[PDB]
Ligand binder design. Structure first.
Ligand SMILES: N[C@@H](CCC(=O)N[C@@H](CSO)C(=O)NCC(=O)O)C(=O)O
Ligand SMILES: N[C@@H](CCC(=O)N[C@@H](CSO)C(=O)NCC(=O)O)C(=O)O
Lengths: 215, 215
């Protein structure tokens, strides 16, 4: 049979990306939970360069880097549920905004709960600015992908699950500042592929309380 | 129909120059002064305000590797820059990504820092080059018998190696001879040779910058 395996860790927004892609495409796979404090031989063998999850393993061959795995999924299971545009220019723009998520949302978000004072103030400001820029791109559309979820939705909506982390350690009210963004995230969460892939905000928060205290 | 906003010593712009030459695409090159950014640059890449920007019929594509993929997809029936096989494509994207993480920033630290920080940058930089030599293997190019995505992503940084060698006090030629021989093979292709400035030109550009710095 055609074997699909996903090496993952439940609160990771990067893993959630690949979970959504597999679910949206209707692909049967085996989910394997890693302890990143005791990485399995499989993980170390499949992703020697980064030793990170997620890793997608397709008939024994690995694809590391979440957005690269999502693109691999789109290209191999290409006969349903398109996740990227077919127009080259629109595809370039989807790639651009997914890239933007990596560098702004993830990086700045991490500073909100791991930094302090003037630096943490900066990230809070810039983070809200990034959210606002993303709201502008969404505009009045149902999803970033338009009528269906696409590459940018998949890149971005997992970070919503970390919003209580950002809000609580950052003393931010994101819904007050960015209501369009929060309504969009809630729309995504009504889709089975997203609902089943994303942990509850409070579960992520309680997990981060435990790891942050050691920092 | 095709315009490129660029700055001649930027390795990122060099990627797009190689892609355009490989495909035989006629275009207008426009040199930007990044201390006095043009209204067109600010109009076309408002988000990052960086070069390169590819502009196709008035529509901008920013981020060098996204632009290279756009070029591959639109002018798709000659000189493939990426594999058709999805797994091989994912691996090319993986190693291009690795280049994006490592080379520019470590290289920059080599000529702008001092002390232990500088020696740590040197060490990590050579480690990255060696990992890339390993991936190249016995292949002519990263892309196999012709240049591909990873070659395009990486060879521009070779134009900066006299900068790294001189200010870093290291001999990349001795430490990484397989890497340097590969770069010299690339420079024998017309598309690469015409896109890449001489190492000596890049070195003298940086010489005049660096002598003004208090490090
Ligand atoms: N660019 C990559 C990032 C993956 C990542 O950070 N993964 C973490 C998840 S836990 O926070 C990871 O596996 N880290 C390994 C570790 O903490 O040792 C991608 O997009 O897949
Ligand atoms: N991720 C991008 C990086 C482009 C970049 O750094 N561009 C520099 C070139 S000069 O060092 C730039 O335009 N910087 C603008 C500035 O210094 O203001 C890409 O791959 O295209």
């Amino acid at each position: 049979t055609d074997e699909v395996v996903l090496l993952d860790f439940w609160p990771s927004p990067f893993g959630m990306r690949v979970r959504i892609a597999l679910a949206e495409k209707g692909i049967e796979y085996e989910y394997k939970e890693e302890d990143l404090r005791n990485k399995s031989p499989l993980l170390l063998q499949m992703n020697p360069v980064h030793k990170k999850i997620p890793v997608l393993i397709h008939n024994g061959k690995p694809i590391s880097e979440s957005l690269i795995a999502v693109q691999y999924i789109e290209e191999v299971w290409n006969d349903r549920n398109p996740l990227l545009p077919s127009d080259p220019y629109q595809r370039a723009q989807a790639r651009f905004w997914a890239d933007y998520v990596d560098i702004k949302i993830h990086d700045l978000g991490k500073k909100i709960w791991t930094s302090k004072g003037e630096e943490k103030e900066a990230a809070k400001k810039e983070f809200i600015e990034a959210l606002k820029l993303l709201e502008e791109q969404l505009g009045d559309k149902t999803y970033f992908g338009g009528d269906n979820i696409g590459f940018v939705d998949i890149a971005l909506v997992p970070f919503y699950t970390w919003f209580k982390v950002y809000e609580t350690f950052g003393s931010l009210n994101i819904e007050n500042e960015c209501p369009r963004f929060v309504a969009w995230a809630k729309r995504c969460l009504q889709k089975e592929s997203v609902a089943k892939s994303l942990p509850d905000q409070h579960k992520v928060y309680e997990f981060v309380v435990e790891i942050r205290k050691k920092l």
